[PDB]
């Protein structure tokens, strides 16, 4: 779910 966060896409790229 976090991957959906614009701040997560940068923190968890491997996920998104």
Rounded CA separation 9/11 (Å): 6
Residues 13-16: contacts with CB within 8 Å, 24+ apart?
A: none
Rounded CA separation 1/6 (Å): 11
Rounded CA separation 1/8 (Å): 9
The answer to whether the beta carbons of residues 14 and 8 sit under 8 Å apart is no
DSSP the chain: -GGGSTTHHHH-TTT-
Radius of gyration of the chain (CA): 6
Contacts of 11 (CB under 8 A, 6+ apart): 2
Task: Name the structure determination technique.
Answer: NMR
Contacts of 7 (CB under 8 A, 6+ apart): none
The answer to whether the beta carbons of residues 16 and 6 sit under 8 Å apart is no
């Amino acid at each position: 779910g976090c991957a959906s966060d614009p701040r997560c896409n940068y923190d968890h790229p491997e996920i998104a």
